[PDB]
Amino acid sequence: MKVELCSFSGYKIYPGHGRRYARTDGKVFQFLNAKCESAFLSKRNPRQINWTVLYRRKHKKGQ
Amino acid sequence: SHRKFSAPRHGSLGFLPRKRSSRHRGKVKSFPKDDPSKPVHLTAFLGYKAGMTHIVREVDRPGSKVNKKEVVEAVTIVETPPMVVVGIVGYVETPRGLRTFKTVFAEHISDECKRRFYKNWHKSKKKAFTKYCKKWQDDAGKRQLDKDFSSMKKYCQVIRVLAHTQMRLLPLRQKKAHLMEIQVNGGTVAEKLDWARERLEQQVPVSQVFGQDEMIDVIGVTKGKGYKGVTSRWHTKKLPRKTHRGLRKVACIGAWHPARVAFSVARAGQKGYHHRTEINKKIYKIGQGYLIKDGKLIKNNASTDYDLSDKSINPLGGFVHYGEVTNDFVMLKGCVVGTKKRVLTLRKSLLVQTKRRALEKIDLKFIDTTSKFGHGRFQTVEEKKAFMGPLKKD
Amino acid sequence: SGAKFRISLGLPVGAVINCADNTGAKNLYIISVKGIKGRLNRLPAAGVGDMVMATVKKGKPELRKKVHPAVVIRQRKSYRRKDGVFLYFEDNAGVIVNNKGEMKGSAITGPVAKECADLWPRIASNAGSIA
RNA sequence: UCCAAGGUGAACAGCCUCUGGCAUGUUGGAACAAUGUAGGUAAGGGAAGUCGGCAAGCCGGAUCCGUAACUUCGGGAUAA
RNA sequence: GCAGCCGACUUAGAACUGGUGCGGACCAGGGGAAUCCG
RNA sequence: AUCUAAUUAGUGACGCGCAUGAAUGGAUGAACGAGAUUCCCACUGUCCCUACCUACUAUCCAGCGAAACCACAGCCAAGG
RNA sequence: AUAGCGACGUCGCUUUUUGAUCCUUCGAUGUCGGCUCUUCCUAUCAUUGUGAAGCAGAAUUCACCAAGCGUUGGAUUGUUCACCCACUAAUAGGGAACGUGAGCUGGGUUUAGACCGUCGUGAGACAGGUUAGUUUUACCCUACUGAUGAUGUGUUGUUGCCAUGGUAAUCCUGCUCAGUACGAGAGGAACCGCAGGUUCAGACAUUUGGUGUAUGUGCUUGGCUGAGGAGCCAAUGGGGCGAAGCUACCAUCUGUGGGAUUAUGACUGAACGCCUCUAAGUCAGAAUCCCGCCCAGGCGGAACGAUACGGCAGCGCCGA
RNA sequence: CUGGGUCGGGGUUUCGUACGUAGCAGAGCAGCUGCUGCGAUCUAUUGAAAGUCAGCCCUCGACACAAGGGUUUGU
Ligand SMILES: [Mg+2]
Ligand SMILES: [Mg+2]
Ligand SMILES: [Mg+2]
Ligand SMILES: [Mg+2]
Ligand SMILES: [Mg+2]
Ligand SMILES: [Mg+2]
Ligand SMILES: [Mg+2]
Ligand SMILES: [Mg+2]
Ligand SMILES: [Mg+2]
Ligand SMILES: [Mg+2]
Ligand SMILES: [Mg+2]
Ligand SMILES: [Mg+2]
Ligand SMILES: [Mg+2]
Ligand SMILES: [Mg+2]
Ligand SMILES: [Mg+2]
Ligand SMILES: [Mg+2]
Ligand SMILES: [Mg+2]
Ligand SMILES: [Mg+2]
Ligand SMILES: [Mg+2]
Ligand SMILES: [Mg+2]
Ligand SMILES: [Mg+2]
Ligand SMILES: [Mg+2]
Ligand SMILES: [Mg+2]
Ligand SMILES: [Mg+2]
Ligand SMILES: [Mg+2]
Ligand SMILES: [Mg+2]
Ligand SMILES: [Mg+2]
Ligand SMILES: [Mg+2]
Ligand SMILES: [Mg+2]
Ligand SMILES: [Mg+2]
Ligand SMILES: [Mg+2]
Ligand SMILES: [Mg+2]
Ligand SMILES: [Mg+2]
Ligand SMILES: [Mg+2]
Ligand SMILES: [Mg+2]
Ligand SMILES: [Mg+2]
Ligand SMILES: [Mg+2]
Ligand SMILES: [Mg+2]
């Protein structure tokens, strides 16, 4: 297996789940589920979505 | 006039009486052919459907791309607590068929097995087999049934062990255990019978009935769908939108002069809850149930030699609509018939198989245990807590 | 040595797709799918890596009003790899080849699916990116 | 045929409310099968369906730009 | 030409701000090229 | 000839016109048309190829309750 | 002359063409096509097994057993027919009241409104063209699909047998064989393996996708409860995301073995001293047939369990 | 001394960070001589709040309930 990270949410992707996406200019992206996929397609910036690992890291929450 | 354009007919007439099954437990219509050369062994088992999940496994088949690659496959979990052998029944061939000759029952029968003999256990006085059981502790009964054993050995050609499941260990509402006759295939009738006579009132685990990476058959009852129209019962073509008296129908029933509706014409009616036997399902893993080993319990029955975790086969929050499985289970490739917590009959293969798919060895490297009650995200609670960190609830 | 696995097919007859080469054609009107027998009322459909017949509805004048073999290299319908990943691209696109297999053009713009690549070796040589 | 409130809004449009009125339009209860009648939503394709884009769907208000052929010189025109 | 006191809805411009959402419900023209006839 | 991959369709020409033709009006033509046709863009469950959801039915029950139709009636094959 | 054809003749079969007739129906059998769906025929296009070529291979002809299984997607036309484009293995032909309108549609024929051409003095006519033109009823009987139940075994229950019915799988590609056999060359096979796919069938929901009134959780328009908070109304207010459940070649899983034999090729072997597959006897033999696997389970049976109080009582077996 | 049922508690999961309070965070504006008010929004408490079987999983926490009722059947 190659356990790997979601492009938008930043969670952990397991072999059976998720969805792959290939843009016309390369840049293969990976999504945990339709939630993250729809956010990315609607071009939501992960920095302002609260439940995202990027948002938590940027706001220094946890640790 | 002929049809302008041909098309294969919808549905199959091989399953023609599309009626609700008269039975709820799958019936073994044909047991594997007997041969005295092989040693004695059972030929069938009873399990319960729990759910489905992934497996990641390495593929070994020269020629294809998946060779030396790893793929994910859907598997179905069947909980199979060990059966209890509570009788033996003999059969003799006659020119009119295969007639039953004599049944002999064990001295001790569990009340969970005696539930099957009553339509209302609550109001009953539970008097079943009370007078029959007295035949074992007196010399009159002992010499009554020993010559019966001798007569069965002399005149019987088929021996089937009457064994019942053990629903006390299942997380189900039902306490009335199922029971069935599992034919004994092995040597001659004498040893075939004096091998069951000590298996009487004893345990039979599935690990000694089936083996790994073996092709078996599953007999069960489909999920019921009730009264369904023709377009969903037979998957006929849907009529155009301009149709006046409905469009989910079949336009022409039949010609004129046959003067009757033929049995081959699709009609509305009952869909689902049919009896079905699907062959060639491959065992992937015969799991081991929970067991207490020196105080603590061993739970890692879903831990492979490539994963080395401590996760059980149960997903997070247990199997949806079934519960959690704690007994030895059987993992089958692909989907199987029936609904959740439905009883299934496992049957040994009727055919001799010499094929790459049949003889392929199986070596799993990952069993998915994420939650099925939604989009699961974490394999186990420990890793979920490690990723999340402390919460407000503590 | 290994034939392609079945993948979902989301390009029936009548679909116009991008032409990702330098032949000058900008459209590809799927006309029929090679190797399809079909049944009653069932439209022939093509997926990644399948040879089709196509016409150019927009492009260089000499490429129009004619029937060209073509190969589909990208599709937007999600298809499942045997390893268990569902993959789908941004657009439906193909290239123009002849019956033997080599491309009429010389270069391909954008990624090329692995199923197309390992099945048509000549296209994989010109493919800038893979999967 | 006469009388005609408040808000939104161009509006006596549609929607909500006050004064006044009414008890769901000649019956109720329990289920939520098929087939209907009336509404919706659908991956990828986009008329390949059909005699025929029938039906449904797209557009839609207002402000600022821009607006062709043709013309009976007025229009076309809310062109696009 | 100024000072004071009252005032009715408009129009334009700017900053800030929201997960690009803003005629958010309701109301509310699909478009173009041609032929026949009137 | 053009339109399409493919056109008994459409448009533009050709005219020997079975049987066109000048107030039994000929030709054209802006604007208009719940008029008749063809093509293109956009859009879509028309279709590939179906699925799911909602409301009222249908369903069962309490009460209440007709009508069309009816020689006698109602399982088939062949024969005459 | 007879691989393949076949003149001049001559004998037949079929009722999927048209005729001929007028037997039934005029107190009405709804009159073209298309859509949908089932079954049947073989005069076999492909596939299985064969025999013959002017069959070297490849390709292609002719013939036999044979209808098990397939026989497509579109432009033009109301079409049936026809033609073309493309794929395919093949795009064979037909019947069932020219199958099928209380199944649809109504484009065409075939009412009443109109227009034109020809004909007529005229009203009007035209298997000439054009445009618009209400498609009713099942709750009865049967058939069919499913659902209770009845029938005997003393009453009930559990486990079972199978008489009978139904029946299902199909075709292709790639690799290897092999650039080999064959052939001067160009070209160019086959079996056995291996990997897949088409059509069909039976399931199923881990995963992907669809639905979504858990009316679950945010957002938001107009109004309303004095305001905040909390909410509500707009026949589901609208719009994101969405559990469960249903559900898609739009996801995933599975799809089988024998027997007697047909065509044909043979063995031994007479009739007919030799010869002969046939006369007696024997062999191989297939998408055919039958059965198995699979679905249902008979006014059809089997084995086994328990068999009606403690105030009454009902029962079972025995007392030749 | 066992059983289910209701409620509660955990598990899972959906959405996305609640009310209140605090902030020298806030385009700015008004009043009082730096202070006080209006102010969409932002930050912290806050992966918070809410829902979660009705056909999800476990409980051994609380509560009451459960030795019933009716009609039949004989070799
Ligand atoms: Mg046919
Ligand atoms: Mg209608
Ligand atoms: Mg789930
Ligand atoms: Mg069709
Ligand atoms: Mg009402
Ligand atoms: Mg009322
Ligand atoms: Mg009234
Ligand atoms: Mg009414
Ligand atoms: Mg769609
Ligand atoms: Mg879409
Ligand atoms: Mg068509
Ligand atoms: Mg319309
Ligand atoms: Mg215009
Ligand atoms: Mg003209
Ligand atoms: Mg007019
Ligand atoms: Mg057309
Ligand atoms: Mg013309
Ligand atoms: Mg004249
Ligand atoms: Mg004149
Ligand atoms: Mg005239
Ligand atoms: Mg009633
Ligand atoms: Mg009739
Ligand atoms: Mg009649
Ligand atoms: Mg024949
Ligand atoms: Mg009829
Ligand atoms: Mg008409
Ligand atoms: Mg008329
Ligand atoms: Mg009724
Ligand atoms: Mg049979
Ligand atoms: Mg799902
Ligand atoms: Mg979803
Ligand atoms: Mg879902
Ligand atoms: Mg508020
Ligand atoms: Mg109203
Ligand atoms: Mg959604
Ligand atoms: Mg044989
Ligand atoms: Mg012979
Ligand atoms: Mg033989």
> With helix as H, strand as E and coil as C, how does chain B read?
CCCCCCCCCCCCHHHCCCCCCCCCCCCCCCCCCCCCCCCCEECEEEEEEEEEEEEEEECCCCCCCCCCCEEEEEEEEEECCCEEEEEEEEEEEECCEEEEEEEEECCCCCHHHHHHHCCCCCCCCCCCCCCHHHHCCCHHHHHHHHHHHHHHHHHCCEEEEEEECCHHHCCCCCCCCCEEEEEEECCCHHHHHHHHHHHCCEEECHHHCCCCCCEEEEEEECCCCEEECHHHHCCCCCCCCCCCCCCCCCCCCCCCCCCCCCCCCCCCEEECCCEEEEEEEEEEEECCCCEECCCCEECCCCCCCCCCCCCCCCCCCCECCCECCCCCEEEEECCCCCCCCCEEEEEECCCCCCCHHHHCCCCEEEECCCCCCCCCCCCCHHHHHHHHCCCCCC
Nearest CA to B358 out of B280, B288, B294 is that of B280
| φ, ψ for residue C62, nearest 5 deg | -75, -15
Cβ separation of A22 and C84 shorter than 8 Å? no
The length of chain B is 394
Tell me the resolution in Å.
Answer: 2.9
Q: Which 88-117 residues of chain C touch chain B by CB within 8 A? A: none
Looking only at the bridges linking them, the beta strands covering B215-221 and C79-80 are unpaired
Nearest CA to B342 out of B79, B28, B19, B27 is that of B79
Distance B269 CA to F60 C1' (A): 19
Write the CA distances from B329 to B82, B207, B292, B323, B324, integer angstroms.
10, 9, 17, 14, 12
The experimental method behind these coordinates is cryo-EM
What residues have CB less than 8 Å from B119, skipping those under 6 apart? Answer: none
Nearest CA to B270 out of B244, B308, B215, B233 is that of B233
| φ, ψ for residue B303, nearest 5 deg | -100, 120
Residues of B in Cβ contact (< 8 Å) with C1: 63
d(CA B319, CA B106): 36
Sign of CA dihedral B154, B40, B89, B197: positive
Cβ separation of A1 and B375 shorter than 8 Å? no
Cβ separation of A62 and B379 shorter than 8 Å? no
As beta bridge partners, residue B105 has B87
* A19 in reach of chain C (CB within 8 A): yes
* Residue C102 DSSP SS3: coil
Under 8 Å between Cβ of C45 and C33: yes
- Whether the beta carbon of A44 falls within 7 A of nucleic chain E: the reply is yes
d(CA B385, CA B391): 9
d(CA C52, CA B260): 47
d(CA B145, CA B41): 24
DSSP C5: P
